[PDB]
Paper text:
As proof‐of‐concept, we designed protein binders to target three distinct epitopes on two different oncogenic targets; vascular endothelial growth factor (VEGF) and interleukin‐7 receptor‐α (IL‐7Rα). Using the described strategy, we sought to design proteins able to prevent activation of the VEGF receptor (VEGFR) by quenching the receptor‐binding site of VEGF. We named the designs utilizing the first scaffold Sam and those using the second one Sima. We selected eight of the best‐scoring Sam designs (Sam0.1 – Sam0.8) for experimental validation.
To evaluate the accuracy of the computational design, we sought to determine the experimental structures of the designed binders. Alignment of the experimental structures to the corresponding design models showed that there is an atomic‐level agreement with overall backbone Cα root mean square deviation (RMSD) of 1.8 Å for Sam0.2 and 1.7 Å for Sam0.7. Further analysis of the per‐residue deviations revealed that regions with the highest mismatch (Cα RMSD per residue > 3 Å) correspond to the outer rim of the Sam binding site (e.g., R56–M58, A64, F95, A96, D119–V121 for Sam0.7). We ascribe this to the open and closed conformations of Sam in its bound and unbound states, respectively.
Author numbering: 0 to 91, 95 to 119
Write the structure that this text describes.
């Protein structure tokens, strides 16, 4: 069965925590088997869990400082939710990210679109 509104926030609230600490391996396992990431939305989709790992290694790999919610987690009963948030980095940077997410019956991320500022 599809994860409830409750379970979605529990899973999506966890996303921002794994981002803030920059846990790549953990986030990659949140995603379903042949999941799609569209980040930013308008660029070619990233199919497969393998290539998603690289996207997150692009974003986090360098070393993130913070990743914090800039609005409420809008969870639906269709196993989908969106949340506007922000990421900040340490270099010798910041960006407003607004992810929408779709969960399968197994509680994993099927599709993400992310809109960057």
């Amino acid at each position: 069965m599809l994860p409830t509104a409750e379970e979605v926030q529990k899973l999506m609230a966890r996303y921002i925590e794994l981002m803030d600490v920059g846990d790549i391996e953990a986030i990659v396992q949140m995603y379903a088997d042949d999941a799609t990431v569209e980040a930013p939305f308008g660029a070619p989709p990233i199919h497969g869990r393998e290539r998603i790992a690289y996207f997150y290694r692009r974003m986090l790999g360098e070393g993130i400082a913070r990743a914090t919610l800039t609005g409420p987690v809008r969870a639906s009963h269709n196993g989908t939710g969106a949340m506007p948030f922000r990421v900040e980095y340490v270099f010798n940077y910041a960006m407003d990210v607004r992810v929408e997410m779709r969960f399968d019956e197994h509680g994993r991320i099927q599709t993400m679109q992310a809109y960057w500022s």
